[PDB]
From Swiss-Prot:
Family named by the database record: Belongs to the protein kinase superfamily. CMGC Ser/Thr protein kinase family. MAP kinase subfamily.
Main EC class the enzyme belongs to: transferase
Main localization category: cytoplasm
Protein species of origin: Rattus norvegicus (Rat)
Residues where Phosphoserine is found: S16, S212, S214, S250
Gene Ontology process terms (BP): androgen receptor signaling pathway; animal organ morphogenesis; apoptotic process; B cell receptor signaling pathway; Bergmann glial cell differentiation; cardiac neural crest cell development involved in heart development; caveolin-mediated endocytosis; cell surface receptor signaling pathway
Protein name in UniProt: Mitogen-activated protein kinase 1
Reaction equations catalysed: L-seryl-[protein] + ATP = O-phospho-L-seryl-[protein] + ADP + H(+); L-threonyl-[protein] + ATP = O-phospho-L-threonyl-[protein] + ADP + H(+)
Length: 316
């Protein structure tokens, strides 16, 4: 013990305040971030923890936070906590957007890294489902890494402001691109584009900017409660992107428009976004890898599964 308890091996030496701490890596001689997880009484927490560990251990990508080490007891009986060790990140996009104007070059670079990581995620048959500024970590040289796969789902199976319209009306990979579109909007103005105060308010905010959906888009909504809801709303005209973002690069707004497309079947794909003129300085498909290994219970089995998943980091 070396405090409540935050007991992290010989390897992790200094300390600054499941809870998170910065700490000194005595091997790699860089400081690191350590998340103390205590999930084992709660089936729900065991689920999120298992999913996040299984996903992060399979993934190897520059724009996805890796797991460098896992600290736990050598036996299931003694394992009450798990410590996840990750690269120390200066900041996240949430904190950055609270006080910093982003240059066009930073917006372009951040967007490119987000999309590059998301291409990899999607190629593994994973949906993130909770992309938001606080889940995007930056280091001091503006390298960007995607955080938090606790809520992730297989493509064959969240936070209101970034939620796609079809989540309220109806699903696919397209959910994540909408979130990215919301984040780009937020990078352009330093304010959330759709700050809904409740579930249906989020739809009112989207339609306030996009305008009322077309007959063609509504024809795609087969759920009657959802379609009739949309038909009950007063008509709204589209607000042009250049009215909202008079300073913005016209290529950025073109791409924004294609990401914030109401109909998920018409919405731009991640790989089409990467190939958009806005990202031409960065785009290099051979340097935009896909996953080698795409993805295909009570407390006690999940605890056992978390034990097994974490075995590779043990001295053996």
């Amino acid at each position: 013990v070396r405090g409540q308890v935050f007991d992290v091996g010989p390897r992790y030496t200094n300390l600054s305040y499941g809870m998170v701490c910065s700490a000194y890596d005595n091997l790699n001689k860089v400081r690191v971030a350590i998340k103390k997880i205590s999930p084992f009484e709660h089936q729900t927490y065991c689920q999120r923890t298992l999913r996040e560990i299984k996903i992060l251990l399979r993934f190897r990508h520059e724009n996805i936070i890796g797991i460098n080490d896992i600290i736990r007891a050598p036996t299931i009986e003694q394992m009450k906590d798990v410590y996840i060790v990750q690269d120390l990140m200066e900041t996240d996009l949430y904190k950055l957007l609270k006080t910093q104007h982003l240059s066009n070059d930073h917006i372009c670079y951040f967007l490119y890294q987000i999309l590059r990581g998301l291409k990899y995620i999607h190629s593994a048959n994973v949906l993130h489902r909770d992309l938001k500024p606080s889940n995007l970590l930056l280091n001091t040289t503006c390298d960007l890494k995607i955080l938090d796969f606790g809520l992730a789902r297989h493509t064959d199976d969240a936070t209101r402001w970034y939620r796609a319209p079809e989540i309220m009306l109806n699903y696919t990979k397209s959910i994540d691109i909408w979130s990215v579109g919301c984040i780009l909007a937020e990078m352009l103005s330093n304010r959330p584009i759709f700050p809904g105060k409740h579930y249906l308010d989020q739809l009112n905010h989207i339609l306030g900017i996009l305008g009322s959906p077309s007959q063609e888009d509504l024809n795609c909504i087969i759920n009657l409660k959802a379609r009739n809801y949309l038909l009950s709303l007063p008509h709204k005209n589209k607000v042009p992107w250049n009215r909202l973002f008079p300073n913005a690069d016209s290529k950025a707004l073109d791409l924004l428009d294609k990401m914030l497309t109401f109909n998920p079947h018409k919405r731009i794909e991640v790989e089409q976004a990467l190939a958009h003129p806005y990202l031409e300085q960065y785009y290099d498909p051979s340097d935009e890898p896909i996953a080698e290994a795409p993805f295909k219970l009570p407390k006690e089995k999940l605890k056992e599964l978390i034990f097994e998943e974490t075995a590779r980091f043990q001295p053996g």
